[PDB]
């Protein structure tokens, strides 16, 4: 079994092919607290131990570990998150080989050549031993690494002359990863990583607002509100203090404007790209402003209906 694991700070995305050749996808939010959870009734809890420390998957706890940083790539929580994603995917527990991911600036030196040091640090992290309480964990056999952003442009780069270049803008929870890549993947003009520019800018602001509105929860719940920002009834069902909905929506709106302006300023630093692609969960939030800011003709702008999965799908199309 070979499983493609785009292991992002916010969500693990999995893609893999079944025995009968059908392709499956699974997403798994990285919300874990440093304590075992308690099972009541029909609730199956996932309690893990790694290096003498206990964790549980907990989607609602305000004490869920905040994972919005570079260190997380090689962290213990990462290993828990990836095992948990495997254990909730529907695949039978087993040995597996995996292809995981690194941020551009971790995967590449300033010359756009692999940073074998960091690439190996990544592979070694998945050697850490982990226990699931009252159950068996998958065993992680062979580990290979790919860069983030770039693999998502695979299909599009195929029908692109080697003179055209595609700007792939990957906005995740922690990091803005930008790459400019020549047609047929014949070259890489430029990479760029900003690990202080993520949707967490918004997540963090929404989380604080929710707490003020007496809806104290995890980063995940805050993202859940960002995802449903356009649904006033959803907002009204989730947010406890009915009198403070505008505090959440406006806090969200201001951080979104900040997100936008910061992202657009970053684009000003690229030039000569003929095509523009926007991928990641953040794509939904910035795609209009990007298309507009780049004056790229409609046909040269690329945005899928499942932006969060663009990367892991590309990893699959390439490496499976």
């Amino acid at each position: 079994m070979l499983v493609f694991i785009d292991d992002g700070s916010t969500n693990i995305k999995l893609q893999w092919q079944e025995s009968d050749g059908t392709i499956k996808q699974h997403i798994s939010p990285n919300s874990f607290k440093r304590e075992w959870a308690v099972s009541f009734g029909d609730k199956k809890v996932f309690n893990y131990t790694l290096n003498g420390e206990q964790y549980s998957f907990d989607p609602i706890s305000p004490d869920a570990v905040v994972t919005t940083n570079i260190a997380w790539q090689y962290s213990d929580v990462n290993v828990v998150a990836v095992h948990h994603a495997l254990l909730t995917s529907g695949l039978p527990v087993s040995e597996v080989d995996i292809v995981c991911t690194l941020p551009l600036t971790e995967y590449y030196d300033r010359n756009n050549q692999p940073n074998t040091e960091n690439i190996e640090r990544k592979k070694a992290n998945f050697r850490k031993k982990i226990t699931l309480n009252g159950g068996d964990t998958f065993t992680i056999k062979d580990v290979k690494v790919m860069p983030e952003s770039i693999p998502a442009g695979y299909e599009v780069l195929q029908e692109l002359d080697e003179a055209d270049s595609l700007l792939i803008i990957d906005l995740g929870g922690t990091t803005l990863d930008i790459s400019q890549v020549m047609g047929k993947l014949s070259g890489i003009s430029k990479i760029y990583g900003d690990s202080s520019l993520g949707v967490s800018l918004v997540t963090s602001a929404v989380k604080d607002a929710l707490s003020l509105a007496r809806t104290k929860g995890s980063s995940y719940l805050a993202d859940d509100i960002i995802i449903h920002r356009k649904d006033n009834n959803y907002l009204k069902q989730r947010i406890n203090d009915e009198n403070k909905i505008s505090i959440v929506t406006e806090a969200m709106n201001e951080a979104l404007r900040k997100l936008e302006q910061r992202v657009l300023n970053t684009l000003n630093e690229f030039s000569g790209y003929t095509h523009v692609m926007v991928i990641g969960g953040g794509a939904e939030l910035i795609c209009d402003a990007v298309k507009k800011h780049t004056q790229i003709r409609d046909e040269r702008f690329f945005k899928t209906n499942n932006s969060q999965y663009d990367l892991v799908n590309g990893m699959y199309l390439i490496g499976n």
Binding site: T116, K144, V145, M146, P151, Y154, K184, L185, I318, G319
Partner: peptide, 13 residues
């Protein structure tokens, strides 16, 4: 296809 997929393999390390 073949040229792109070829180059794609440098993305796997």
């Amino acid at each position: 296809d073949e040229e792109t997929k070829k180059n794609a393999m440098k993305l796997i390390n």
